[PDB]
Paper text:
The complex is composed of the catalytic subunit ChlH, the bridging subunit ChlD, and the subunit ChlI, which serves as the motor that drives the entire complex. The motor subunit ChlI belongs to the superfamily of AAA+ (ATPases associated with diverse cellular activities) proteins and, through binding and hydrolyzing of ATP, provides the energy for the thermodynamically unfavorable reaction of Mg2+ insertion into protoporphyrin IX. Here, we used a combination of cryo-EM and functional analysis to investigate the mechanism of the ChlI motor subunit of magnesium chelatase from the cyanobacterium Nostoc sp.
Iterative rounds of 3D classification, performed by multiple-class ab initio reconstructions followed by heterogeneous refinements, revealed two distinct classes, which we named hexamer conformations A and B. These reconstructions achieved global resolutions of 4 Å and 3.8 Å, respectively, with much greater local resolutions in the central parts of the structures. Interestingly, each monomer contains a bound nucleotide molecule (ATP or ADP) in both hexameric states. Our reconstructions with no symmetry imposed revealed structural differences between the constituent monomers within the ring. Notably, the region of the insertions displayed varying levels of structural organization among the monomers. In the hexamer structures, the nucleotide state of each monomer is related to the structural organization of the insertions of that monomer, such that when an ATP molecule is bound, the insertions are folded and in an upward position. If ADP is bound, the inserts of this monomer are more flexible or even unfold, as demonstrated by fuzzy or absent corresponding cryo-EM densities. In contrast, in most ATP-bound states in our maps, these side chains are oriented toward the nucleotide (insets 1–3).
Author numbering:
A (entry chain E), C (entry chain C), D (entry chain B), F (entry chain A): 14 to 93, 101 to 124, 137 to 353
B (entry chain D): 14 to 91, 101 to 124, 137 to 353
E (entry chain F): 14 to 64, 147 to 156, 189 to 353
The structure:
Amino acid sequence: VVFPFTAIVGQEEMKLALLLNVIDPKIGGVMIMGDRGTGKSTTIRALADLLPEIPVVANDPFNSDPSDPDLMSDEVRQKSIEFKKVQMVDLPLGATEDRVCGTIFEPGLLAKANRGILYVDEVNLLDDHLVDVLLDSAASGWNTVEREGISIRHPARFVLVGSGNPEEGELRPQLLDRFGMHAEIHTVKEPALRVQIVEQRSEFDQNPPTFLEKYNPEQTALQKKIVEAQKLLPEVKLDYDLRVKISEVCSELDVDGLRGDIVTNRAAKALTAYEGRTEVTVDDIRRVITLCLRHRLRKDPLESIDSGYKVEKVFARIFGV
Amino acid sequence: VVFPFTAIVGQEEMKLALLLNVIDPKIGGVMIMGDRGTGKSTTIRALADLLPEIPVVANDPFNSDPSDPDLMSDEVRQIEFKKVQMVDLPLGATEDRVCGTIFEPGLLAKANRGILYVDEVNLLDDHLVDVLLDSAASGWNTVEREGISIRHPARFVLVGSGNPEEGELRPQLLDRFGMHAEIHTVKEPALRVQIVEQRSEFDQNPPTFLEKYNPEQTALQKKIVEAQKLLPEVKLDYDLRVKISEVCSELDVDGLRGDIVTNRAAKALTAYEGRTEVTVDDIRRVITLCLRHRLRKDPLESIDSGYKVEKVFARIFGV
Amino acid sequence: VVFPFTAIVGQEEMKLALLLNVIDPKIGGVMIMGDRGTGKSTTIRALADLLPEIPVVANDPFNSDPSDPDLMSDEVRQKSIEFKKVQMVDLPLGATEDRVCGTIFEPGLLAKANRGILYVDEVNLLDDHLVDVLLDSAASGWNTVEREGISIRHPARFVLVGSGNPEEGELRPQLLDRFGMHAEIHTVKEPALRVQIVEQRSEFDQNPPTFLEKYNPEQTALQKKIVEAQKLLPEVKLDYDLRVKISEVCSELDVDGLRGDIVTNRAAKALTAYEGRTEVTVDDIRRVITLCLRHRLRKDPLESIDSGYKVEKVFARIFGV
Amino acid sequence: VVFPFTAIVGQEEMKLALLLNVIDPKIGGVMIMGDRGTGKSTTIRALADLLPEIPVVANDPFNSDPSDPDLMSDEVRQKSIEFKKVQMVDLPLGATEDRVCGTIFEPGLLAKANRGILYVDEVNLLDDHLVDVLLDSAASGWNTVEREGISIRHPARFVLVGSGNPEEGELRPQLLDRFGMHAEIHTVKEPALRVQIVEQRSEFDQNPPTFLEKYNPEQTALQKKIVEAQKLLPEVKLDYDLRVKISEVCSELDVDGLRGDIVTNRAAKALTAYEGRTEVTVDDIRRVITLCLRHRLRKDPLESIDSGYKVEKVFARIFGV
Amino acid sequence: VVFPFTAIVGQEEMKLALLLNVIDPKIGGVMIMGDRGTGKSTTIRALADLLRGILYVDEVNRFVLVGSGNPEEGELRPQLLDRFGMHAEIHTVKEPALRVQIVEQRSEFDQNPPTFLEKYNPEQTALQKKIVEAQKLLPEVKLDYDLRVKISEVCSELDVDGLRGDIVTNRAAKALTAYEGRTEVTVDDIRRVITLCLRHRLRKDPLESIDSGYKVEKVFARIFGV
Amino acid sequence: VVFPFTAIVGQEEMKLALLLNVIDPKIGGVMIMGDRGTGKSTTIRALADLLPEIPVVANDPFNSDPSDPDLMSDEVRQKSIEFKKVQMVDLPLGATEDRVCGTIFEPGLLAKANRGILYVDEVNLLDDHLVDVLLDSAASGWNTVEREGISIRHPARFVLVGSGNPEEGELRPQLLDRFGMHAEIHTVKEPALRVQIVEQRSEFDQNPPTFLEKYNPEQTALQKKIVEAQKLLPEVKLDYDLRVKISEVCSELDVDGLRGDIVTNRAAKALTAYEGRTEVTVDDIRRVITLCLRHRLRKDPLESIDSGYKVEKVFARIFGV
Ligand SMILES: Nc1ncnc2c1ncn2[C@@H]1O[C@H](COP(=O)(O)OP(=O)(O)OP(=O)(O)O)[C@@H](O)[C@H]1O
Ligand SMILES: Nc1ncnc2c1ncn2[C@@H]1O[C@H](COP(=O)(O)OP(=O)(O)OP(=O)(O)O)[C@@H](O)[C@H]1O
Ligand SMILES: Nc1ncnc2c1ncn2[C@@H]1O[C@H](COP(=O)(O)OP(=O)(O)OP(=O)(O)O)[C@@H](O)[C@H]1O
Ligand SMILES: Nc1ncnc2c1ncn2[C@@H]1O[C@H](COP(=O)(O)OP(=O)(O)OP(=O)(O)O)[C@@H](O)[C@H]1O
Ligand SMILES: Nc1ncnc2c1ncn2[C@@H]1O[C@H](COP(=O)(O)OP(=O)(O)OP(=O)(O)O)[C@@H](O)[C@H]1O
Ligand SMILES: Nc1ncnc2c1ncn2[C@@H]1O[C@H](COP(=O)(O)OP(=O)(O)O)[C@@H](O)[C@H]1O
Ligand SMILES: [Mg+2]
Ligand SMILES: [Mg+2]
Ligand SMILES: [Mg+2]
Ligand SMILES: [Mg+2]
Ligand SMILES: [Mg+2]
């Protein structure tokens, strides 16, 4: 039993963030920000049942693929089947590295997290000491147990989601970077959508196994659209002039550089590419640049003005509207 | 024997809050606020006897039901009733006794289809409150450690208390909780003499005092048994459904998790009253006990929490 | 053997209250706070020869009672006479949980002391994790032996006495309300009393088993008096029209009011039994009302006042003795 | 081989109230708060050859007298030879309870100190740890030891020695009262005396086991005086007016309880036995009163006065010269 | 699985620092601090190949450990900040075209990893020889007494308490003019390492607004010569 | 395989203070402080190559000599030889209270420190950590440990030579007051000396054998000088006038305690033995006075007067010129 994905109401930006990162497991981690409730856990939980079946080998927690290039493991000695879905690998609050990585073999939490989706809890409460060690091993590619005199490395490539709390401050500016881009969640105030959410929740609760039937065609239409858009990635091209055009708008924001501009063009051919259109445009980048790369900024709290206005204003003049 | 449940005198708020929770074990847990030396603990233990007998499969530790789904833990793969046992955890107990690792589901399976509680949660040992609270709202359990998925259908209620002068709970957990109950100390000696009369007569005659109010307890048991089946008939009109949440929209309430409580409780209010259509006035008798612990969470001065919930709601619902 | 109880000079307040608890073991514990080196820690240890007899089970592994309606012993709920003196057991600040309850079963120090006096010294200096197993066990009735794959409930029905110094710290407010019927002791002023006490223990230290011989014919009669209060413990008369007066007082001090009233009602009537009368009197209450509920009154820390006087400050307003 | 006691020059104050406890191990503790290098830890260790011999039972279970009331050994008492000198033992700078109390039976360290001398070095240290254990055996003469399933009593009574630096804080006001004597040690301010100190010490380092031989009869002539004092300890009488004056003085100083006020009445008897007189005179009052009743003052840093000037002024105003 | 060595775009300051560190071990370790994400871990992992022992230190706030200090907090305690090599700041790229082809870089790496090395295989090859012969030059290089008395004069003028800033420079400036082929150290080749070195061990003492290299340039030019 | 001792250029304070200590193993170790990189730890490592040879007992359980009576540690007293090289002991900054002293045969660390040299690095740190337990053999000859049921005696007689930067802070008096040797290291500021000390650092690193062969004879000459000085150390006297002068300087300078005067006489005797002349006059009292007493003076908590000039201000004023 699980809640349907498309049955949710609103939350276009957050769902848009999932739509971008899900196709490419190389853009990086993605923060999601917002107040309590709002079904943040449900949405990512709703993400589980939208994908083609992924293959296992026999039972391994990594189970990336029975035949793939990066399969550095002792099982290759045997080399030299079944189809499953994604399993969410949420970790408890105040955990310890004894099972996240392991000791002197035993498996790890990140081992089960391989190729899946790792929903980490409130990172503001979590201490930096227990998370800095392999915060995202995808950049490293595989595991590293060089500590305590061990030499085992296994793949740990997967996507991250932050899900912080905007009540006890934010993470350190150094730690905020290298993750990815931001994501804001609003709060509905119109009673119509409120009562709609209440009615949908009550109807699902009353009839668990029959509600999803009324929302069946969308749950497969979206999956088919994503599957079709998956194969269009290695065909999109970007104009040389447009590539340098953005380079004259990031500098005025005093961006750290060399990674802020490497994620826009890494994800530019996903919003303009999943619609089926091959040639990139200018206005399409407009949507993907307002939120992405904005969270870097320069951490200037001594200012009271529309922060988003800063992103679009400098962007308009360089691109000439 | 124990204290009579109906023998409690002068308290109705927490009594009603517990009564609405006993009927349908789906609203959520209830916490109770007040003052020390008031008498909250005895009433909680008095509920352990007022109950209808519930059957079992084979007197298994899970002890949920002989029938009905969701009991897949070696219960419906292919017997007496007794009564529900209230489970109290000991002080200073970590996960070793909460769930164990090697199965021995102590303190949880015995609490499944039962009552579990703890007091003075305002400085309760941490790392433990989160584990049970998240699983209380969750379906069955979280025993994923050691690579095992034997998660037992630990479905029950949760009762907690504390002290409003020694500190409160984390805001990240209070808003996730259920109903909010607050009591006080009776200031009239005319009933305090009645209170001190009890605990001084029934002690020397428990066999005599067991039948002192037996007809009332039997009437209450039959009333709750009858009212259990009356709930799945109440209907709420569309206009009144959107009439609420106008105050919540006018006020500042975090999310909608604190809104479903009114819909899932107000219907149960008329379940044991014999009614089938909801009214306007009765809403004010249940809206106050919920969503009031959240408010605007801005404690800068002395603000009456009840005044904001009640006075504003009166204008919306026309007094 | 030890210092005779009746040889203590002065200190009427402490001597009047602590003996009153023997005749009725239903009231809770007792603690005394005051200046060090003033008379405590020896009078309490001198109460080992002032206790009557009580029934006892055959070999009594439960150590509570063989002839009561509620037994819940090891060999009562399954199986279904003797007289012994009630014992007093003291525990130091050296042991830990390993022996207070115990398991493999052997009983701990807590389990053996039933319906008696359990004396611990310097409860102010008592380390934590020890009072936690005593916060509510002594006020509930039974303990938990849930460890080691079994589950037993040894009884908790006794009275514990403590004696500390109010300079090294203060107890947690939960302890200050769990207790009841306590007293405070200051130093002596009259020089002749000082001469008397300095003579004492020096006339005594010359020959231990000679000083008690002089007081032997006088100390025995006390054992007769309290036994009389055992027969007069029931049948004590207290009109309901005075119960309102004993309860109106608490509302004026804004105390919890659900322990002071019960303790006063259960102790004032018993105070008459030791005397000999049957009908209580207003004057018979003013000598015990102040001693109780003193450790429960709440006062503003900025305000400085003596609770031992403020308790009976409003006494004149109610009926004025 | 240790430095002989009858070789320290100067410091007649400490040299008088240090061997006084040898007369009778009942006066109480002794404190010497002084600066470093003044020989505080040297003269104490010299006592190992200036104590008498006392009879004791065989096998030394707890070092208890054969014929004395209140033995309560619980192993040989129900059964109702060799005399030995007292023992010397010190505890190190910090330890655990395993040796202090006892465990696996195997006796603890405190058992050996019974009827002997135990001295603690750097008493300013060992705060809140391994100190509250030694807070019951003093001023009571008994303690209870139980853990790991073994429970045995301890008839332990002795006297204590305190020494350490004076500028490392203060001792907790619970172990302080268990010390019956206190002294202050200065450094000699005189050229001739100082150089005499220098020459006297170095002469011992040349040939150790010849220097003490030059002082053999001088130290032997000292033990006879203390032996005569011990033999003449009985028959010593004090006037009634002397008794009423030895306690009336403490009223003007407000001593924290009448716990240490009896030590002075137990000190004048010992000093008079040293010379040989029987009836205690006024002389043996001012020579000892300030030595013992000096650290029992609650004056605190509130007035411009220190040392024992207040004690001398009050004593002189009450009586004397 | 690895990133090319000579394909890294940089101001050559980090490259020269690490090259002088590897050409002679017993000089310490070049700490790097000033920014984050720019090139630190990539350069450090690049140094792990195409080469005694090499280590790495993170989150600061024969064996050589270059490490990578925390940029936000700065450095550690000045008393423990020593026992290392020269300290270098982090350059921030500004030219838009530089951003253009640096973001073009590693894109083809993502497209096809086990080919990028080949695209940079030949020229990088020459690098592994440019140091191999260099090691057979340091035993055959001398220095003049006039330069020896010239050195430690800058240290004497400043407060360089701790006699280690007059040995590491002579052990480093010697090595810089020991791999090109030249045998005599020029009067200006000293300037190529003194500005980089003597940075951490100057007892900063922030009593006035001071620049990193302004002092080490002005005081050096004041006496040593313009 | 280290820097030869007879090669340090400049800073003769070390090669006098630390070298002179080896003559008479009675004064405490050196308490040098200074900046880093100046060689404060280089010369200490060099002393390991130049040390005398003493005899020890068989198997050396506690580092004791065989021809030394009265050294009753554990077994020699009841029963009351290879001439092996002495050894200096060092400890890491990370340890535990049970690490230094032998516990559950199992010996300890100080067993190797008896009649040896003990080196401590950054002694200004490590507060309460292994320094409280290291006050036994300082100002005393024995250490008492009875932990875990086994009690022994330690004859440890180490030197306790310290080091450490002074930038962090000062020391609590108890630790520092046991040091008798104390130099003051200052960095060189002469270009010729700087280039000189730069020069020979290179060739020694290139070929240590050539450097040590070059600097061979001076080490042998120094060893012979030390041996002759130690042999001729006794039979050196002093007149009365110089002793009373050395008392007067300390008395007027007001040094706390008495350990100050003891050390200076031994230092002067050892220095005049190192020179070779039997008689001693006013030559070694002008040189080794501040170096043995400057650190002891701690009467300037607020005054800003240089410490080095203070001693010589009064010395020449009273003594001699
Ligand atoms: N789109 C939605 N808007 C509002 N409420 C929703 C939405 N979807 C689901 N809900 C309901 O809102 C309630 C709160 O959701 P949920 O418990 O998943 O919150 P959460 O994201 O885990 O909260 P928190 O941020 O406090 O950890 C649930 O009853 C859920 O069914
Ligand atoms: N209606 C009542 N009002 C007040 N007290 C009552 C009432 N009924 C019973 N009591 C008695 O009041 C006492 C309260 O005991 P209880 O264990 O409930 O503590 P409490 O006052 O709730 O506080 P605490 O949290 O400190 O235990 C009991 O002796 C109980 O029998
Ligand atoms: N009536 C009395 N008044 C005062 N002291 C008395 C009296 N009777 C006996 N004593 C003796 O006076 C001494 C007081 O010591 P005691 O142990 O009673 O002090 P305390 O108040 O318990 O101190 P602490 O708090 O330090 O343990 C004991 O030796 C005790 O025997
Ligand atoms: N009368 C004396 N006064 C002072 N010192 C003396 C005297 N006689 C001998 N000494 C010598 O003075 C030194 C004192 O050493 P000791 O450790 O006992 O002193 P202390 O005052 O107890 O020191 P600390 O307070 O630092 O523990 C020893 O070397 C001892 O031989
Ligand atoms: N007399 C001297 N003066 C200065 N430096 C010297 C001298 N003799 C040798 N050196 C060299 O100076 C350097 C100092 O090294 P070393 O680490 O021992 O110094 P340090 O001052 O003791 O350091 P630290 O305080 O950091 O422990 C070494 O290279 C050493 O060979
Ligand atoms: N030659 C180069 N010049 C500038 N930036 C580069 C170069 N090579 C890689 N980068 C960028 O540097 C980033 C690596 O950041 P890194 O320095 O490892 O972070 P951190 O400083 O936290 O270790 C990569 O994302 C890459 O885009
Ligand atoms: Mg959530
Ligand atoms: Mg309770
Ligand atoms: Mg006591
Ligand atoms: Mg000493
Ligand atoms: Mg060093």
